[PDB]
Design a protein around this ligand. Sequence first.
Ligand code: 0J8
Length: 278
Amino acid sequence: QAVQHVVIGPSSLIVHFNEVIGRGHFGCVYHGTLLDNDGKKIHCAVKSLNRIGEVSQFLTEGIIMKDFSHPNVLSLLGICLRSEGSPLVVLPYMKHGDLRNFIRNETHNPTVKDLIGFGLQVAKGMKYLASKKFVHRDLAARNCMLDEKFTVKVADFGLARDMYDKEYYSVHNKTGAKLPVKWMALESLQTQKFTTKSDVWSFGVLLWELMTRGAPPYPDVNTFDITVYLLQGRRLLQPEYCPDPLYEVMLKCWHPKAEMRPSFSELVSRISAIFSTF
Ligand SMILES: O=[N+]([O-])c1cccc(CNc2nc(C(F)(F)F)nc3ncc(-c4cnn(C5CCNCC5)c4)cc23)c1
């Protein structure tokens, strides 16, 4: 026990295994139905982890993840160990899928204000995580979800940590770490260490993705050259319809001196002000 408050009884959960809605390196994600305490049926997303010594680490992870709670951070609904043996991670269903795919979709019409609002939401989610001394390491539009109410959830963390799109990652050959090179702070490219200050660099990249509606960053600088491009002081350019003040905020996030970058509390303030004016 001690993980009992995280536990979901098997007969209280249906996983719709024919309906794959996501795939990461650590397992598939399926549509599911959970019967809550209320006795109401709710839509969930279920994560099937394929890959006994490491079982107790999973229960360990479930409880710490359960303690995190915020409107803009992905929440853990529960975990279900079945007779199958494959641990199941139960998370709320995100109607609009990941934020990058939502904005790239040409049939969607998010407004400039919408896009700035998504950004603010992440800033808020990230503010809460940095206060709990949590470093994300992989903040990006592809790793934020969008629910039915246009609420952004910072995901890719705890039991949901994975690679869902291999395309942008280098996997280090010695340490195993995923390295999303084009979202990485300069100092992270050099030392492979990550901080809240490097999260801030990445949030900057995320804002740029928002104001370009999911364009690939630095499409013409190869991976290797990214380090000298940044050492040369060069940075991503202002997208066409990105307000001047917001771009200034991006540039702040990319200052070569980590200490010189704003904190997420400071980013929430500047961006709320931008969001509310005009
Ligand atoms: O953990 N992540 O940050 C992450 C990032 C990218 C992909 C995933 C796996 N995809 C997912 N992970 C989760 C989570 F994290 F809560 F379990 N919840 C999810 N809810 C809904 C959907 C989904 C898939 N298609 N759609 C609709 C898109 C518009 N039309 C058709 C259906 C929604 C994908 C999820 C996870």
